[PDB]
Design an enzyme around this catalytic site. Structure first.
Site, short mmCIF file in Angstrom:
data_model
loop_
_atom_site.label_atom_id
_atom_site.label_comp_id
_atom_site.label_asym_id
_atom_site.label_seq_id
_atom_site.Cartn_x
_atom_site.Cartn_y
_atom_site.Cartn_z
N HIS A 114 0.83 -1.18 0.00
CA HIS A 114 0.00 0.00 0.00
C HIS A 114 0.87 1.24 0.00
O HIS A 114 1.91 1.23 0.57
CB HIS A 114 -0.87 -0.01 1.26
CG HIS A 114 -1.85 1.09 1.36
ND1 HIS A 114 -2.65 1.45 0.29
CD2 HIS A 114 -2.23 1.86 2.40
CE1 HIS A 114 -3.47 2.42 0.66
NE2 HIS A 114 -3.24 2.67 1.95
N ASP A 131 -4.05 8.61 3.72
CA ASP A 131 -4.21 7.16 3.54
C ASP A 131 -5.54 6.89 2.83
O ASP A 131 -6.60 7.06 3.44
CB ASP A 131 -4.21 6.44 4.87
CG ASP A 131 -4.35 4.92 4.79
OD1 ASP A 131 -4.51 4.36 3.64
OD2 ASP A 131 -4.27 4.28 5.90
N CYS A 184 -4.10 2.95 -5.14
CA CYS A 184 -3.65 3.69 -3.98
C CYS A 184 -2.62 4.73 -4.45
O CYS A 184 -2.69 5.87 -4.04
CB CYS A 184 -3.11 2.80 -2.87
SG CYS A 184 -1.67 1.74 -3.24
#
Ligand SMILES: [Cl-]
Length: 240
Positions: A114, A131, A184
């Site tokens: 991630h 995030d 992401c």
């Protein structure tokens, strides 16, 4: 159907963002910052900025794709550090995080890996934590406290003229990347672009609820970025 941005294409996108916003220094993503060393990496960049402001030599090492003279010019000019953090839940150290990342890369697989983004905005003296999965590393209120402590180290390392203190912002109030495994990287660069356009960007509160619509707008953003970086030099810092 909006695929995985690796460290290569994130780096290029940052180079492009520099040419639009020279205050941004296009920090390399290979090998990337991690949860274990992102504080040291930031401190080390800001010590190098202070050194350059004094006409001193720098310590922290050259980026691979940048000349010494050009790096100095970037450090002189920069007002914003885009720190891209590669995370995986299993490794418990820097050494193991590095080893894990090399393993998934040499297999070309994704995993539970991630990207997070920490923005160090030097002008505003603001740390922004983004995030796209909201709490992938730890709950936001715990990241907030950890970053407030960090923010007090930066007050010593990189003082303001008037003792104005670094403040902290946790950007995502909810999971942003809904029902997508791979987006992401792109989300990080989207948020960064919003922030460069407007550091008080409310763009995350203004998102469509529909996860698919959201990811179409992101696919747009991604194509516009891919078009703009097509001709730009490979593995090569822009000249500040
Ligand atoms: Cl810069």
């Amino acid at each position: 159907l909006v695929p995985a941005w690796d460290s290569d294409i994130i780096f290029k996108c940052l180079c492009y963002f520099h040419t639009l916003y020279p205050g941004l220094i296009p920090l390399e993503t290979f090998p990337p910052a991690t949860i274990f060393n992102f504080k040291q990496k930031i401190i080390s960049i800001l010590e190098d900025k202070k050194a350059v402001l004094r006409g001193e030599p720098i310590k922290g090492p050259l980026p691979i794709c940048c000349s010494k003279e050009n790096y100095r010019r970037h450090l002189q000019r920069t007002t914003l550090l885009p720190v891209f953090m590669w995370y995986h839940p299993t490794p418990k150290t820097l050494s193991d995080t590095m080893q894990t990342m090399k393993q998934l890369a040499i297999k070309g697989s994704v995993g539970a890996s991630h990207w997070l983004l920490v923005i160090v905005d030097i002008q505003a003296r603001r740390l922004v934590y983004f995030d796209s999965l909201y709490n992938y590393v730890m709950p936001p209120e715990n990241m907030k406290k950890e970053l407030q402590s960090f923010a007090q180290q930066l007050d010593q390392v990189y003082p303001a003229y008037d003792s104005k203190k670094f403040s902290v912002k946790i950007a995502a109030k909810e999971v942003i990347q809904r029902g997508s495994g791979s987006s992401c990287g792109a989300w990080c660069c989207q948020f960064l672009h919003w922030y460069l356009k407007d550091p008080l960007t409310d763009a995350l509160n203004d998102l469509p609820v529909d996860s698919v619509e959201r990811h179409e707008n992101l696919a747009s953003f991604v194509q516009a970025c891919e078009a703009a970086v097509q001709d730009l030099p490979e593995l090569s810092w822009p000249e500040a």
